């Protein structure tokens, strides 16, 4: 089964960057503004997604990113049969990654708020796996920072990839992707990391359920679960229209 | 083929221009909270780096009048090419800065209550344009604008020049994005990009009409028009000094 | 004697790594908070690997591990006799490197407790050399975090010098690398650097013992001096296991 | 318009190459130490050095080989690779750029500079400006501290140099060849203790040490710090012999 082979890189890739990005995350948020800032929460996502697109990238095509996935399938350039099995990898894996995460920091986890994992609030430890919203990210503000951020994230991939365009040697690709995660960071008010990746937040989000969170995850800030998971989606049909129009539908 | 080319042109400076100037949003409006300085240029910095690998392969990834400039006087462009990448360079910049009022449409407003203040503590039309500062008066800025420019159009010709050893796809287009964060860290200005005329025009004609009214061209003793006039001179300072060291003896 | 050569150049590759790292160390922690923090402490680190295997990489191979060196033999890539070679060849190196970091923060050293040496504490100078247990960094808990660690190093290690790939061009391997090193740093939580490397702690560690710090370096934290030795070797196992069940055997 | 001179030629990018180098690495330096912990610290003046070489190299590489260093070019001739006679030719266009590198610097912040302590220009000290552009010891700096770190970190610098440059390895693509030497300049400064950038080059040493005594502050840039001047010349040179024969024995010597 060849569709299988590509699932298992798929899944890799996408634990190595989770594993490496949220685990950044932690050392920021419970070390209180001591061992790094906002700087260093997005330079390590930046880089994680280059070692992640390196070790997979000739097996599967390293998208670890629904949205990229289903850019793909809106161009015809991979069957439409390679949608769900590449969003299960990828939720697979980030859920794992999640899960590797806890366990090295369990006990300061635990201590942040004495005993108790509390969801949200001043000592809130379940911002370290999934997004949340702030004061000024509201579900209407943070539906449109997501649709940017993913429209943005497509045009640049598509510029790369496209076969008019002359074929980059292997190496370079990979940096580039991992640059447009540390530039978007920086840019939209998301201080989380990798904002715009669909598997990156549910598949943490799911494991802050069951690891002891409580079912908070999926009621609070107005039932913001589901805003990261269809707004990408959204960016990424209108980075296709807006790249195909300017640039790609003239190429020859 | 001359829209086709324009057409890339508007679509690389609107990248380095949303990249960039959201940056700018977050350390003025978080004061001294989500970063200082080195993250305004590095954004901008590799913002430069994504723009030219999209439009690079197509119109040539100029995304600067000046660079264009500097292109034509060399007769390695048609002379057309200079007004129509300019209102392609220009319109995209423009653009460019209305995503980012729409992005930070609600904080930007509240930064001074709810009214928008061209210049002072609470300062919101600094995030697009630049302005003077204590010891940047129109004497003092001149100049840096026009050793800025120069020093970016020298490393700019090293890269692109036909009798060197060719470059490769992509790894000309990180150190073109390397003079850019350098250059914001030399010289003293921290907006990040302060040598190009099209993202400096760009983004202050946008706040015109966005509501900060018309001292945004009247403020700093009229301002607006050096960040146009000194990158175009440091343009045509810079192709001479590259072509008396380097260029004229390259054979 | 071809394995006399290769054995300098590893000496050379980790007498780089040691000083250039260990000095950004010394610097941090004797300018308590006033040259800058953990950033500049990983980025020094990340980017002495690349330098190091860059120097060597004709000539060795560019190991400078001794837990990649492990798996390199384990997958039967390279002779077992390598493997006892490599790993003197890469403690001295690591000892002589630290030796110059000493000699060039003689006197600053000395300053940080008066006229004394103290092994740990808050006036310690002996953790720029090796690393010592934390409040959180038990031996449990401590013990995990290399393993985690190593099997990240040697799975991305793995995917870019696989013979069955696409040949990385020479001067982007020696970058992979140095990514993952930096990266490694800043999401696990071991602030000293490289701490999968085993060489690079017990070749400083040997020498603080006999630089004046005593023997005090190897009983406190519990005998904690072993386990950065014995858990990085496992994990490079577990990181042979991983990348070969998901990539390795499914390549062809 | 033709030089038709190759040793006329080089010596004209080796200039134009260390001036890029001096202009931009002293800017960063003058932007932190005059607004004193607001535009950053210590790692912005060693990143920007770091870059400033990268794209110094690139300028000037086809023409002259992009050494912008005395001690490079020490090492160079010492192994046979280039002539004697570049030795003088090629350290007269390093300094002469640095010491122009150093007059744009002190151009652009002339203001700023003035008005650091008052209305005098004062060497070293709480309110020093003379540290821009030259290096100066400090509290545990002293004339044998500040000498060994010279040393150590000329010689660090040669042995990379020298792995890349070796003709019997694989030719390096152009382009990479200079990301790589801009990466020893920054973690050397990183992990030496030296807090001004680049400090193992004796060009970019004496150039803008040079233009300081004209430039208004004195005489007391050469007379002090124990006669400090003479120190970051002659030891990068002796540590550029020592990183040549580190590298020759342990690498160069059993290639074939």
Not at 110 to 128: D, K, Q, R, Y
Not at 219 to 237: A, C, F, H, R
Request: hydrophobic share 50%.
């Amino acid at each position: 089964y060849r569709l299988l082979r590509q699932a298992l890189a798929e899944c890799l890739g996408t634990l190595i960057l989770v594993m490496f990005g949220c685990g950044s995350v932690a050392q920021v948020v419970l070390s209180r503004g001591t061992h790094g800032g906002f700087l260093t929460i997005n330079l390590a996502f930046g880089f994680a997604v280059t070692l992640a697109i390196l070790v997979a990238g000739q097996v599967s095509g390293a998208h670890l990113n629904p949205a990229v996935t289903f850019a793909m399938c809106f161009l015809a350039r991979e069957p439409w049969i390679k949608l769900p099995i590449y969003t299960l990898a990828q939720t697979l894996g980030a859920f794992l990654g999640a899960g590797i995460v806890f366990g090295l920091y369990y006990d300061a986890i635990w201590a942040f708020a004495g005993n108790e994992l509390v969801v949200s609030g001043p000592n809130g430890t379940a911002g370290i796996f999934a997004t949340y919203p702030s004061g000024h990210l509201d579900m209407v503000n943070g539906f449109f920072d997501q649709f940017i951020g993913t429209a943005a994230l497509i045009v640049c991939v598509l510029a790369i990839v496209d076969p008019y365009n002359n074929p980059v040697p292997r190496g370079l690709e990979a940096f580039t992707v991992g640059l447009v995660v540390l530039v978007i960071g920086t840019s939209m008010g998301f201080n989380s990391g990798y904002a715009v990746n669909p598997a990156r937040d549910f598949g943490p989000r799911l494991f802050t359920a069951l690891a002891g969170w409580g079912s908070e995850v999926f009621t609070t800030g107005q039932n913001w679960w589901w805003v990261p998971i269809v707004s990408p989606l959204l960016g990424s049909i209108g980075g296709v229209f807006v790249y195909q129009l300017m640039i790609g539908c003239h190429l020859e």
